[PDB]
């Protein structure tokens, strides 16, 4: 069986949630289901990024970093896939995976996912990982325009895996409160986590008669897309997709144009692994605690329509979209493949301010915050051959992310963006520098005030 079609190469960049969805063209589009989520924090392994920028790597730092990082992440991805998971998205610091099932099967799948999580830690018993698990209701949001599409999962099961991850330490498996409540406590030995109703898994000791492989095989019964039969030894059913112009047209909207060029063998397959000077514009849109996914969807859609319009003008791109802690964040990048300018900084700031001004007027968005940072970041396709994504990794990515969270409601920028801007100083305001999560000394940070006092 030949399987190297463009449609298959595109499907590699997407989860089954998208590849085998059959939903409408209306945007936003929303859907609701239940499942188990797994969040694998892979920092410590992506904190090395600074080492590989050193002159010791003789201008092959990016290539060496992508190689060693994919060595490890692809092993994590194989475990997830073999246990029936769907990897939803990659980021420099983590990956999120989903086991979507009927509510009545959540109990058994949690055991599958816990076994998976511990086999993942088993891969690193000679850097390590941190794993959070959650279970419950999940809402999916698809937004975009006629040429591009983005998706998110939303809900407290998503927020649950957020906090479960934040509590974890190296080699931990933390289960959200609702996951612990729905899990098979007959099999899962836990321990308290102080002043937190979430729990840490110590052992998975099953009944004497329990045979996991038979148990897993029965669980695959409810996994709609687990490879089986003649395809039992494929990691993804996506690998079997055949040409379908209508499906490919839909799928390619989720994929960055430069990726598609490479997919089409119109660009060298290594062109996108690089250490590149870029400007990160990290946009956060916050909604109120009580806001529900059917009201958030339209707000994100309206914000997105304007965001993409401004980025096209100032020649930026959306690398990633996330949502947790009731905030939807856009990881935007300027100076990405091909399109780099020496006025990129003023454009990034002006684009930020434009996005700040519009989005603050979108209703149901309570707060807009944008962090801007410029510097060298690693760019590359990260993951497994059969499931990977273009991602950016580096100090300035994390800095932009921290700035938008620690300085809400304004546009902030780093000392690099400030000095290099083709703009005068009174356009800015030096900020009180706060102590931020896992951040080296910033340098001075600034608020982009804009051209007016008003």
Ligand X SMILES: CN(C)CCOC(=O)c1c(Cc2ccccc2)c(-c2cc(Cl)nc(N)n2)nn1C
Q: Which residues bind ligand X (CB under 6 A)?
A: 39, 88-91, 93-96, 151-153, 158, 161-162, 165, 322-324, 401
Tokens of 328: 């939807």
> Which DSSP string do the residues of 62-124 spell out, in sequence order?
HHHHHHHHHHHHHHHHHHHHHTT-EEEEEETTEEEEEEEE-GGGHHHHHHHHHHHHHHHHHTT
Q: CB of 156: closest distance to ligand X in angstroms?
A: 11
**Shortest separation between residue 59's beta carbon and ligand X, angstroms:** 27
Nearest approach in angstroms of CB 397 to ligand X is: 7
Cβ closest to ligand X, residue 350 vs residue 389: 389
How far is C-alpha 452 from the chain's CA centre?
A: 36
162 is in an annotated binding site: yes
What residue number has its CB nearest to ligand X? 91
The distance of closest approach from Cβ of residue 155 to ligand X in the complex, given in angstroms and rounded to an integer, is 9
101/296 with CB nearer ligand X? 296
Q: Least CB distance from residue 232 to ligand X, whole Å?
A: 28
Residue nearer to ligand X on the CB measure, 154 or 216: 154
DSSP string, 277-343: EEEEEEEEEE--TT--HHHHHHHHHHHHHHHHHHHHHHTEEEEEEEEETTEEEEEEEES-SS---TT
What is the separation, in whole angstroms, between the first and last Cα of the chain? 65
Which tokens in the block code for residue 22?
């059959």
Tell me whether residue 43 is annotated as binding. yes
Burial status of residue 117 (CB atoms within 10 A of its CB: 0-12, 13-18, 19 or more): buried
Smaller CB distance to ligand X: residue 95 or 168?
A: 95
Least distance in Å: CB of 453 to ligand X?
A: 33
Residue 400 among known ligand-binding residues: yes
In whole angstroms, what is the distance from residue 236 CA to residue 22 CA?
18
291 is in an annotated binding site: no
| CA separation for the pair 259, 265 (Å, rounded) | 10
Q: DSSP letter for 364, please.
A: T
- To ligand X, the closest distance from the beta carbon of 248 in angstroms equals 21
Instruction: Give min distance, CB of 385 to ligand X, in A.
Output: 19
89 assigned to a ligand binding site = yes
- Residue whose CB is less far from ligand X, 96 or 318: 96
d(CA 191, CA 444): 43
Q: Which DSSP letter does residue 27 get?
A: S
Q: Which is nearer to ligand X, 152 or 373 (CB)?
A: 152
Whether 197 has a binding-site annotation, put simply, is no
Q: CB 170: neighbour CB atoms within 10 A?
A: 12
Task: Label each residue of 406-450 as H, E or C.
Answer: HCCCCEEEEHHHHHHCCCCHHHEEECCCCCCCCCCCCCCEEEECC
With respect to ligand X, which residue has the nearer C-beta, 216 or 293? 293
Does the annotation place 401 within a ligand binding site? yes
Q: With respect to ligand X, which residue has the nearer C-beta, 93 or 302?
A: 93
Structure tokens at 79: 């475990």
Does 273 count as an annotated binding residue?
no
Check the annotation: does 340 bind a ligand: no
CB of 94 to ligand X, least distance (A): 4
Q: Measuring CA to CA, which residue among 279, 269, 281 is closest to residue 308?
A: 281
Question: Does 402 count as an annotated binding residue?
Answer: yes
Q: SS3 for 126-137, per residue?
A: CCCCEEEEEEEE
Does 276 show up as a binding residue in the annotation? Answer: no
Choice between 94 and 168, CB closer to ligand X: 94
Query: Could you tell me the sign of the dihedral formed by the alpha carbons of 239, 268, 278, 54, in that order?
Result: positive
Query: How far is the C-alpha of 366 from the C-alpha of 381, rounded, in Å?
Result: 34
Binding residues: 41-46, 89, 93, 130, 153, 162, 323, 392, 398-402
Binding residues for ATP: 41-46, 93, 130, 392, 398-402
Binding residues for Mg(2+): 41-42, 93
């Amino acid at each position: 069986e030949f399987q190297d079609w463009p449609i298959v190469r595109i499907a590699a960049h997407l989860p089954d949630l998208i590849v085998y969805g059959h939903f409408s063209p209306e945007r936003p589009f929303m859907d609701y289901f239940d499942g188990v989520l797994m969040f694998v924090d892979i920092s410590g392994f992506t904190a090395m990024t600074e080492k590989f920028s050193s002159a010791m790597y003789m201008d092959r730092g990016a290539e060496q970093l992508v190689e060693i990082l994919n060595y490890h992440i692809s092993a994590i991805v194989e475990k997830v896939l073999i246990f029936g998971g769907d990897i939803l998205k990659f980021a420099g610091d983590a990956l999120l995976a989903l086991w979507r099932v009927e509510r009545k099967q959540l109990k058994n799948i949690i055991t599958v996912v816990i076994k998976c999580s511990l086999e993942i830690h088993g891969l690193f018993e000679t850097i390590r990982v941190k794993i959070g698990l959650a279970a419950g209701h999940i809402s999916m949001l698809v937004f975009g325009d006629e040429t591009h599409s983005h998706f998110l999962v939303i809900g407290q099961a998503v927020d649950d895996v957020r906090l479960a991850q934040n509590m974890a330490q190296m080699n931990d498996v933390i289960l959200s409160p609702n996951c612990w409540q729905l899990c098979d406590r007959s099999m899962i030995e836990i321990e308290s986590v102080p002043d937190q109703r979430a729990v840490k898994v110590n052992f998975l000791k099953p009944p004497p008669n329990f045979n996991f492989d038979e148990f897993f095989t029965k669980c695959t019964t409810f996994m709609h897309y687990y490879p089986s039969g003649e395809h039992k030894n494929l990691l993804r059913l996506a690998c079997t997709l055949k040409p379908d112009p209508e499906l490919e047209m839909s799928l390619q909207k989720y994929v960055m144009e430069s990726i598609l060029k490479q997919i089409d063998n119109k660009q060298l397959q290594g062109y996108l692994s690089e250490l590149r000077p870029v400007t990160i514009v990290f946009v956060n849109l916050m909604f109120e605690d009580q806001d529900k996914a059917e009201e958030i969807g339209p707000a994100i859609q309206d914000a997105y329509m304007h965001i993409t319009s401004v980025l096209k003008i100032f020649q930026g791109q959306i690398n990633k979209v996330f949502m947790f802690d009731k905030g939807c964040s856009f990881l935007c990048v300027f100076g990405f493949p091909g399109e780099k300018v020496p006025d990129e900084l003023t454009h990034a700031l002006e684009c930020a301010m434009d996005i700040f001004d519009f989005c603050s007027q979108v209703h149901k968005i309570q707060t807009v915050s944008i962090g801007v940072a410029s510097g060298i970041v690693f760019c590359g396709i990260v993951g497994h051959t059969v499931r990977h994504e273009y991602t950016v990794i580096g100090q300035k990515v994390n800095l932009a992310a921290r700035m938008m969270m620690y300085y809400p409601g304004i546009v902030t920028c780093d000392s690099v963006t400030y000095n290099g801007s083709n703009l005068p100083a009174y356009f800015f305001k030096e900020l009180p520098k706060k102590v931020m999560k896992g951040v080296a000394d910033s340098g001075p940070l600034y608020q982009y005030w804009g051209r007016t006092e008003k």
